[PDB]
Ligand SMILES: [Zn+2]
């Protein structure tokens with residue numbers, strides 16, 4: 256309730272944080288410990304774009 | 305405002321003039337003498353007190369009380385100031 | 395008429411003087427007596443702290 | 450008993466580790482612990498406990514409520530050994546000034562203020 | 576020791592025959608400016624307790640002073656010791672010793688009585704009046720004084 | 730666990746349990762060189778001792 | 793790090809500070 | 825040996841002999857008035873610390889003129905909010921009125937701080953002595969001292 260808006264009911268994070276951590280958790284469900292940095296490397300150049 | 309000057313004393317009353325003098329000069333001077341509470345001041349009258357250092361001064365309590373270390377010292381600029389009755393007014 | 399004491403206290407009633415502000419007289423709160431602020435110009439504190447003796 | 454306790458630093462805003470304890474008993478039927486504390490600006494707070502809870506009073510309020518002396522006379526009793534230590538002189542003039550700043554210029558006004566501030570915890574008749 | 580003096584306890588034992596010694600709670604004198612000193616004493620001299628109780632007064636041009644011989648304000652060095660005044664003639668070597676009294680003189684002001692009626696100050700609250708014992712006078716600790724301000728802003 | 734905390738008196742040691750009137754002792758001290766706490770100590774206080782009689786500050790003594 | 797009280801980037805209102813108290817009470821402030 | 829001299833930390837109180845604070849009230853204007861302090865720092869001779877430190881006295885005085893007075897002005901500013909060399913040190917703050925230093929042999933220096941009359945009062949001697957115990961002239965970061973006096977052998981070498 257602290258880190259979310261109470262009008263539009265969204266998380267007030269930057270969206271890249273949410274999508275990166277979502278994809279990293281999806282990868283860590285299947286134990287692929289390699290790709291949690293690879294996703295970060297993809298998102299940093301995608302936000303540089 | 306105004307200074308609260310006062311005389312308001314219901315059971316109390318003033319005191320007249322006596323034989324103390326305010327006459328000062330180069331002949332006499334003052335000495336504050338502090339003594340014990342049970343000290344009889346009359347029984348030094350034929351004895352000699354010092355004015356510097358120490359002296360075991362003979363005295364007369366019931367038998368003898370010659371054990372009296374009389375001390376003497378420079379003034380500490382003590383604020384205890386003598387009030388003498390005036391010579392121009394009683 | 396006057397008294398001699400510490401200059402951070404009023405000489406007439408012994409009360410604490412307040413700290414000297416913009417004006418040129420410090421007024422005692424209790425007795426109502428004005429202290430000239432030029433009388434503060436006589437103090438020198440002159441403290442000294444040694445760290446290592448010379449000998 | 451003058452002692453040093455670092456846990457006293459976690460007790461106020463500028464409390465030091467220095468302080469003088471005191472265990473006062475009255476004819477072996479009362480016992481009250483009390484502490485003076487030292488503050489970094491040379492000010493002394495007076496701890497006292499009433500019904501297992503602590504209260505912190507500046508020293509000038511207690512010293513000004515106990516006697517009908519002038520402020521200069523209370524000053525001369527606190528600097529009495531160390532006449533020339535000007536830090537102590539400024540500190541005890543500041544402690545006497547704290548009470549003056551709160552409109553307590555007599556003993557009776559200090560007693561009135563201290564009875565006003567401690568009547569709820571103290572529970573006298575009204 | 577070379578200096579000495581012949582003692583002589585002169586002066587009869589009486590109340591105002593005692594010399595009077597004066598202090599002041601606000602400082603040293605350094606200048607006696609037209610201070611009218613007046614010493615009052617009780618009317619009853621027949622009971623030993625209420626006699627030998629005196630009050631010394633002094634009026635300056637701007638503030639007046641009062642000192643007792645008794646009660647709260649008297650000195651412990653009047654009871655635990657006994658003070659004398661030695662008048663010493665340097666020619667005759669005579670120490671005329673008179674009895675002495677020491678007064679500590681306090682400044683006298685008017686009295687205040689306006690807060691006797693003014694005593695009700697939002698007395699409907701009882702434990703919201705507990706905030707008086709949780710401020711810079713009679714504070715409980717740093718925790719209580721820093722936390723009971725506006726209920727930690729909740 | 731109670732080593733050094735639960736101590737025992739020696740055979741000669743004893744606890745003061747008698748109670749007396751000490752009304753004569755401060756006047757006795759002032760008959761000696763102890764100046765009363767109101768009176769001037771006749772020396773600098775930096776060359777004097779504070780006197781305490783049972784948590785009552787009696788006066789000051791020339792060292 | 794990322795779950796903090798911030799301004800909303802979507803509706804652009806101020807940060808409504810939510811406070812817990814005594815593990816039993818949540819209070820919110822209406823922003824201006 | 826020069827490395828052991830260069831790695832040992834030196835504090836400011838290690839080379840100070842004494843600090844002479846001299847506060848005087850000075851109301852030189854009809855409106856403005858100031859607390860004129862003066863701070864005579866006095867140092868040991870360098871012969872008392874050639875054997876452990878590597879300081880020449882002018883290096884101490886350059887430390888005083890550059891870093892310590894900036895620390896002192898920052899400290900009084902933190903408490904507040906609730907002949908070409910002499911110019912170069914007086915320009916670091918508006919209130920510093922005068923500077924003196926031993927131009928001959930450099931064992932003393934003397935500022936005059938000259939603060940205004942604030943409402944709160946603090947001890948300038950306490951700040952000066954606390955900073956003089958808290959200041960470091962030079963130190964390698966994270967090293968407090970150094971000792972080469974061990975002559976332990978491994979295989980009798
Ligand atoms: Zn929103």
Ligand SMILES: [Zn+2]
Nearest residue numbers: 404407422425
């Ligand atoms: Zn006054």
